[PDB]
Design a protein around this ligand. Structure first.
Ligand code: NAD
Ligand code: NAD
Ligand code: NAD
Ligand code: NAD
Ligand code: DG4
Ligand code: G3H
Ligand code: G3H
Ligand code: G3H
Ligand code: CL
Ligand code: CL
Ligand code: CL
Ligand code: CL
Ligand code: CL
Ligand code: CL
Ligand code: CL
Ligand code: CL
Lengths: 333, 334, 333, 333
């Protein structure tokens, strides 16, 4: 129950291991499952187009990685129920494949002899945790838990702060979001999301996301009160979420900013800036969300007020630092 | 009827002004261009376009002109508009596309230089400002200097107008996810006093101020002071999209918003409609100023509190230019 | 008026149809096979990130596309031997999937009832045609033919002219090549080519190509004289091929250029330019190769001389016009 | 000497400071000249699109930056004449504006009271240093010296090693090169050069470079033996140079790679890799040049032999490391 396996050694999977080693975690990654050879997983861990060289040694054998001198078994089981997690005693699986985003599906890791699963994505009605918003809802008896999306991790601490300070009566969100591997390099079939079939680095691409709609799992009072969507655009990582709200009180911009500032104080998960940053400045962030005071906008006509608030997020590494906080707590229950 | 035009600033917008005029076989002839460079360079840029490809007509040049589709066009290189020799070829209406004369005070220099009227391809303060097929009926014979606002305004205005007319907009805020432009930076480095504009445009999402919502009263007077907004500049070369979040004057469904918008786009050469799952590159070369996208419409309601998000695409280069040219053609016949 | 089937309606497959309709070809495309529904293929045909809206109407039914009012059967058979090509009498298959690049594999289209197959890629030791270089080697007995890569179609007309005018003693090629669907959007496994696993829009990526090595299939006398490779870079289409040769004769730049110009005169496949063009200027090219006199370079020391020649190609549409020319001829034999 | 001015606080200028600080140099930057406000230079230093957050604290006043608690004056003089280098005690001027690339032009820095100038670019016929190739050519009487281009620092070490082991009889280079500030963001005039007028992030753009032409200043025996050019491509930083040589001996690939390995052994300026890297893996390199053994290629037809050797380079930071290496030495004579 400090021994971990990773299913899906992709962008998130590899950064999970990077982060665990960065914080000198007591968690022990003993096994990795993907679809490929150790050779290829080794090369991918060693060379990262977004974060540069792996800061530890990486080698491999025909069935393992050796990362900073320590051996990690590598399996290639496309069906999670066949992953031999018991061989090295992997107890908590960090599920990062995208193919097991529900209770029913991730049960397969427990049938395969793990005790717990932390899914790196929304997964329906199950405990969904944004760290430093609702991580106190985790419980010793939880075996399958979600950390939602990157987008949820960015939205939630902002929504929580506005909710606690002013009340959110209704709101809508748009994230301007880096492209991800669910999109396409060249125009071509991508299941049945038509917009996902289009070349991701050459287009602005609207895309659905549940971040707003499922916010009730993280902040129950906001349940049903938000909606939203993304526009996927050609940056490799680093994204930004705008929320437009009718609040429960009349406010000034200074007041909103000051409230947010207070909520980020002593908060390892939720950062604040008033610097004129742009997306690349978020890359490598150790926050799940960085509230940007410079973009706060209050639109007012007589009685009526609309409030736009904006937070940056590194949808890869930043979200990953959240996934790890949640994992470290999950392992100790 | 005024047939003869001068283009000042033969840049992204100015070159496409020519392109579009020839494409529609306008009776308007471009008789002179002014910029800061040589005919050879302007001819190279006209002939080869990174966004729309090869010019569809022949391009050659001489020491002091361009020859385009067989027709000669004078080239001047006067950085101050008052010195442009517009009377040599009888340039009557100036399409002002440099970014440097974005006021009545500034653009009236073209009149001092012998022109009769000026059409500014950008916002230009509190002057007559036209979005074609929203408020072009406010143009008259006494208008001598006119603005066509920003392409962001040409996107926002028709959408806002349809909504104003059908339901009312009590208050709204806009964000445009906007293609990068020449006002931005290639590599991180100073760009006047806007810190964000200093950053590498093709490697960043860059918040950016725009006045499209702020100054919407110039085009739709009843919405004056009711809208704000900003842009997120992103790494696409052209093609942009504008989201507006409104409190409307009436309780609505999405279907009802989409139908109202559809009716407003019917027989409207400036304002298109789509319910297809398009992306920004599908808007490149659009002949509309704005294309409303029914697939992105969103009603968020809790009790009596309702937010409505409406979304419209626009090719901030060519699509905008089609609107500029519609306004120009009308301007010239008043 | 021969009837054609297209296997693989991808970047090349869809542009094959676009080019046939553009030239008002007598060929009728009567069937398409891919892996997806008519609706997704209709979406992709209609909307193209590189070439804009389809110039003809496009609709679909549950088993067909309707393109400019003509019906094209759609099938979804991953094994070519199950494609019912006889149902609409497809007699020439344009093979564009990447999965049948040999005589032995493409035979499966003849087993399934077609008479000939034109493969849109290198396919080993078979007749391999670059139109206007070696198309006269085609005859009434050929049933399986390749058109090589777009790179071969760029390289061969330049090499052929140099060969004919000066002799090429030895040469090496580098193509700075737009990224394609064989690469990856984000860092992730891509078969066994390590470099192909890396984010294509964010890197310069060395990549092997057979264009130089197998050039002898197209220009027998240059067999074994050339090698080369690619650097894949972040442009969506539009590519350029450099060739550094030792020629059989001492030359000037002007002399090299005049010879190429001659070879491009009344040559619908091979253009010339002495304009300072860049890669977006080649997009939509109706040539397989455009020679660029501005980039010619003669480096000489004593009796020694290196000659660099450079030519542009739209690896998508330009190549496709070559493929269609070859197809037009192959259908008349 | 230990007191430096930087004229041109641009991509190179800022990184010069970053690198000095990273190596705990005993050299101290005491003044900076550019064309803007300390506020804007501070924003630029702190927030870097290529290298992320500055690793030391940055603040400013109306006449200064404060970097890691020390004060650095800031001037805004359009003409080097007018810079009070004297005031703050600026001995050596790192000239990084691109506007003073000759001995005569850089004279101003000495007229305004600096003792030496080190120019960050080629600067006509003057002492031009690639560190660990010809820095032994520097003496105490040197006042204005060049470190040439990024491309020169890539080409020179590789060329040097080949020349020492085998002889280069003639060669031509192509660098596939990240776009830089001399190019355009959108299509528009950029002085006389037509190709530089074109949108840099949307195009492959041929472009002249003197690296090969002027190699004689760094490696005198190669004077007039090399030529070359660049293809600028849409990556922000990270480049690669291919050189095709006729050597003075017959060689194998293994033999060429071992000679280069030897030349890179305990060579802090000149690295080696046999890993399958791509450009982004070079970002942040502490080498001026990294020879890539995986791309070596030998084309032999009897006595004739073309040898292609390929080296990577971070045209920003990698080049900067060499610039600082040279500076440290220049400052102690
Ligand atoms: N990229 C982001 O911005 C981001 C942020 C937060 C959460 N997420 C979520 O995390 C998950 C992974 O995202 P990603 O960007 O790392 O995806 P990715 O495509 O980079 O990685 C997926 C990995 O899973 C492997 N894989 C696929 N199917 C498999 C199977 N059946 N068994 C084992 N391995 C399999 C792939 O080979 C790959 O290495 C998704 O659920 C995604 O929604 C992504
Ligand atoms: N690009 C867009 O998306 C877009 C859309 C709508 C409106 N606009 C507006 O249109 C105008 C032009 O935009 P652009 O994108 O074409 O910019 P641009 O930089 O491409 O073009 C400006 C042109 O004007 C020339 N120029 C500069 N100063 C001059 C002077 N004093 N005299 C003569 N010529 C001069 C330049 O040499 C260049 O050719 C701006 O006002 C801009 O806000 C731009
Ligand atoms: N630059 C280019 O894109 C280019 C140029 C010249 C040649 N080629 C060659 O043309 C061929 C296609 O290239 P592309 O870029 O069009 O690739 P692509 O990936 O865009 O297209 C492949 C298409 O084939 C389908 N497909 C995959 N497996 C299949 C199967 N078993 N049966 C039926 N359909 C299947 C896919 O669904 C897809 O639509 C390849 O051999 C490639 O080397 C490509
Ligand atoms: N970027 C590279 O890859 C690279 C590599 C090696 C060498 N170089 C060379 O280094 C030099 C700088 O290149 P860069 O990429 O840093 O350029 P850049 O354009 O990023 O920076 C130049 C800086 O100088 C300033 N400037 C311009 N004229 C000035 C003046 N008269 N006085 C003071 N400041 C002035 C600008 O404001 C800017 O901050 C050039 O000579 C270039 O050839 C560049
Ligand atoms: O909001 C705006 O949108 P456009 O005129 O649509 O491009 C303007 O501020 C920006 O245009 P510009 O940057 O080319 O001047
Ligand atoms: O799920 C989290 C992020 O918002 C991105 O999603 P994706 O990688 O599944 O496309
Ligand atoms: O130039 C050759 C082709 O573009 C490469 O095709 P592929 O990479 O899609 O196989
Ligand atoms: O404006 C300056 C560029 O960033 C410098 O690099 P370059 O001269 O090598 O193009
Ligand atoms: Cl929603
Ligand atoms: Cl004036
Ligand atoms: Cl505003
Ligand atoms: Cl804008
Ligand atoms: Cl088969
Ligand atoms: Cl080869
Ligand atoms: Cl290739
Ligand atoms: Cl040269």
């Amino acid at each position: 129950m400090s021994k971990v396996g990773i299913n899906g050694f992709g962008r998130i999977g590899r950064l999970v291991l990077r982060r665990l080693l960065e914080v000198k975690s007591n968690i022990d990654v003993v096994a990795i499952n993907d679809l490929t050879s150790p050779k290829i997983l080794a090369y991918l861990l060693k060379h990262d187009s977004n974060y540069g060289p792996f800061p530890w040694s990486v080698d491999f054998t025909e069935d393992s990685l050796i990362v900073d001198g320590k051996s990690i078994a590598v399996y290639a089981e496309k069906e999670a129920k066949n992953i031999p997690w018991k061989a090295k005693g992997a107890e908590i699986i960090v599920e990062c494949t995208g193919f097991y985003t529900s209770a029913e599906k991730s049960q397969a890791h427990l049938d395969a002899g793990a005790k717990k699963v932390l899914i790196s994505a929304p997964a329906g009605e199950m405990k969904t945790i944004v760290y430093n918003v609702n991580d106190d809802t985790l419980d010793g008896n939880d075996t399958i838990v979600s950390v939602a999306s990157s987008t949820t991790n960015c939205l939630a601490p902002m929504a929580k702060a506005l909710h606690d300070s002013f009340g959110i009566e209704v709101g809508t969100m748009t994230t301007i979001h880096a492209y991800t591997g669910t999109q396409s390099l060249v125009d071509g079939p991508r299941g049945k999301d038509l917009r996902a079939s289009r070349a991701a680095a050459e287009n602005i691409i609207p895309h659905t996301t549940g971040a707003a709609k499922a916010i009730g799992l993280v902040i129950p009072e906001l349940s049903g009160k938000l909606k939203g969507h993304a526009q996927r655009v050609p940056v490799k990582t680093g994204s930004v979420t705008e929320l437009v709200s009718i609040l429960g009180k009349k406010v000034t911009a200074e007041e909103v900013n000051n409230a947010l500032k207070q909520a980020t104080t002593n908060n390892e998960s939720f950062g604040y800036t008033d610097e004129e940053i742009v997306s690349s400045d978020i890359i490598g962030s150790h926050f799940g969300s960085v509230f940007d005071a410079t973009q706060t906008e209050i639109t007012a006509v007589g009685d009526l007020q609309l409030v736009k608030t904006v937070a940056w997020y590194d949808n890869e590494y930043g979200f990953v630092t959240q996934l790890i906080r949640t994992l470290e707590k999950f392992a100790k229950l």
